[PDB]
Amino acid sequence: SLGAKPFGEKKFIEIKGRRMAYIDEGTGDPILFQHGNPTSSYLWRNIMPHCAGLGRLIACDLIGMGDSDKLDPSGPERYAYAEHRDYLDALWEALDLGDRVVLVVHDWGSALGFDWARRHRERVQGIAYMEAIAMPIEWADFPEQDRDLFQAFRSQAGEELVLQDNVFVEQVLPGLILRPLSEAEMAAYREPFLAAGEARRPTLSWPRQIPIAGTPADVVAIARDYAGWLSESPIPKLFINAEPGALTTGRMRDFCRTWPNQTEITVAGAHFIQEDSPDEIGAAIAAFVRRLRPA
Numbered sequence: 068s069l070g071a072k073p074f075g076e077k078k079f080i081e082i083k084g085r086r087m088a089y090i091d092e093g094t095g096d097p098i099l100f101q102h103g104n105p106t107s108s109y110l111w112r113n114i115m116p117h118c119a120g121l122g123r124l125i126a127c128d129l130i131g132m133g134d135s136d137k138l139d140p141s142g143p144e145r146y147a148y149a150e151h152r153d154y155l156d157a158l159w160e161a162l163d164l165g166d167r168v169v170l171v172v173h174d175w176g177s178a179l180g181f182d183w184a185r186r187h188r189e190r191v192q193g194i195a196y197m198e199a200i201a202m203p204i205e206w207a208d209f210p211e212q213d214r215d216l217f218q219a220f221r222s223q224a225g226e227e228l229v230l231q232d233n234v235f236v237e238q239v240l241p242g243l244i245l246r247p248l249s250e251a252e253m254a255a256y257r258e259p260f261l262a263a264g265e266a267r268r269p270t271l272s273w274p275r276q277i278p279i280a281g282t283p284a285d286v287v288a289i290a291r292d293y294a295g296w297l298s299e300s301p302i303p304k305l306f307i308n309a310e311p312g313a314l315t316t317g318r319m320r321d322f323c324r325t326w327p328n329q330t331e332i333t334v335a336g337a338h339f340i341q342e343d344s345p346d347e348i349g350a351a352i353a354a355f356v357r358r359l360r361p362a
């Protein structure tokens with residue numbers, strides 16, 4: 068169902084000097100839910116209940132996000148894709164996950180998740196993705212509605228727009244959810260970024276990482292790598308498509324549709340589809356996991 072209560076209380080693990088937060092309920096092999104920008108584990112709160120009894124349900128808060136500690140020093144060079152991956156690889160190792168992990172990913176959680184899988188292909192039982200960054204794109208491929216704003220985030224206008232005005236949290240997020248959010252729900256997304264300044268840096272560093280028209284070249288090479296791999300990998304996949312959708316449309320959707328061993332469903336939503344169709348999403352993930360773990 069919908070609802071504002073969190074799925075569980077946060078547990079903590081020390082990683083490289085910083086305390087990182089995560090939800091961990093139940094027992095069995097892991098079903099790993101990873102959020103992107105500008106969200107936290109809270110994004111999966113109404114989707115995780117659907118998998119009760121199917122495994123150890125885990126949702127990690129990326130460094131500087133949710134209830135995980137903020138990095139200090141912080142600035143334009145902080146929270147890049149490679150730094151996020153360093154902290155996440157370590158937390159995932161600390162959790163003692165084993166070799167039958169089902170990944171459930173979104174937005175930057177999908178770029179981090181697709182890359183971890185390319186690198187640990189034997190420990191991945193299945194991948195469920197939605198509104199993902201599945202390959203490098205052109206501006207011609209970006210959604211028309213926010214093309215100018217994201218070109219601005221990538222320019223020097225980014226700092227005023229995000230660190231000062233908090234535009235990614237206050238405008239982009241609600242603007243890409245079809246239904247209106249309650250105050251408790253908006254408060255849970257706002258919580259880690261209440262303070263002006265560097266506490267909001269993660270939400271600005273992320274749009275500057277998207278691989279478009281060949282820049283930034285380093286993330287473009289990483290995406291080109293996991294795109295080529297996925298288009299040929301036999302691992303079971305679940306493509307949760309959306310209409311109207313946002314990122315995974317046009318050429319990118321045509322490409323994802325060529326991937327092997329994949330099941331597809333379409334749900335209502337723009338970009339943050341977990342807030343519009345949580346039960347349809349959770350039900351498909353549960354069904355996908357029951358096929359992978361026959362009881």
Ligand SMILES: [Cl-]
Nearest residue numbers: 104273274275
């Ligand atoms: Cl972004």
Ligand SMILES: [Cl-]
Nearest residue numbers: 282283284285
């Ligand atoms: Cl570059």
Ligand SMILES: [Mg+2]
Nearest residue numbers: 084085086136
């Ligand atoms: Mg400490």
Ligand SMILES: [Mg+2]
Nearest residue numbers: 133134135259
């Ligand atoms: Mg805090």
Ligand SMILES: [Mg+2]
Nearest residue numbers: 208209316317
């Ligand atoms: Mg298009």
